[PDB]
Amino acid sequence: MTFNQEQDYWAGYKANERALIIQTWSGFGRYAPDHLYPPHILPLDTDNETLGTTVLQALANSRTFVYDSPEDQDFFDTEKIRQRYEDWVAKLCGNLGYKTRRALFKNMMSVDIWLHNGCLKISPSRHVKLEAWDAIDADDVILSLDNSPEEIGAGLKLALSRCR
Numbered sequence: 091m092t093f094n095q096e097q098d099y100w101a102g103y104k105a106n107e108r109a110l111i112i113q114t115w116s117g118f119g120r121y122a123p124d125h126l127y128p129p130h131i132l133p134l135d136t137d138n139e140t141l142g143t144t145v146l147q148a149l150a151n152s153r154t155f156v157y158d159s160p161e162d163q164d165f166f167d168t169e170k171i172r173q174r175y176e177d178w179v180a181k182l183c184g185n186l187g188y189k190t191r192r193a194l195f196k197n198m199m200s201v202d203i204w205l206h207n208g209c210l211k212i213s214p215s216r217h218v219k220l221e222a223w224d225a226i227d228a229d230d231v232i233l234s235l236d237n238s239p240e241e242i243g244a245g246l247k248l249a250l251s252r253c254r
């Protein structure tokens with residue numbers, strides 16, 4: 091896969107009692123889930139090589155906009171974010187057998203992944219609110235593109251174990 095020097099790539103790795111959910115993020119300056127790319131759902135004991143490869147694929151699709159390009163304005167539009175978010179919730183409930191968003195989110199942990207010049211910053215979080223996650227302290231897993239997909243998968247699972 092093609093990763094460019096100086097370019098930022100972002101992705102997310104969420105997990106609850108039914109699934110792992112890997113998602114491409116996009117943006118400019120700050121990044122967020124990019125619902126242009128559907129979530130990739132995986133079983134909880136997916137092997138490290140599949141988990142690493144899936145997150146690398148998600149990162150490769152991460153878009154960086156030119157500020158105020160039609161793509162940037164659309165991506166950061168308040169109402170479009172809301173509509174795409176609600177569609178994501180409804181679709182994930184359908185794909186995982188949930189009838190309430192309360193149940194979908196109850197045990198959902200979240201890890202963020204940032205790639206830049208070969209460095210992978212894999213960050214755990216605290217599930218602070220029903221549908222939101224905030225950083226915790228000094229718990230990142232730092233890897234790089236030197237690492238095999240399997241080593242990346244191990245570091246992803248490690249970061250998930252650090253979520254609270």
Ligand code: NA
Pocket residue numbers: 101102103104112113123
């Ligand atoms: Na995500």
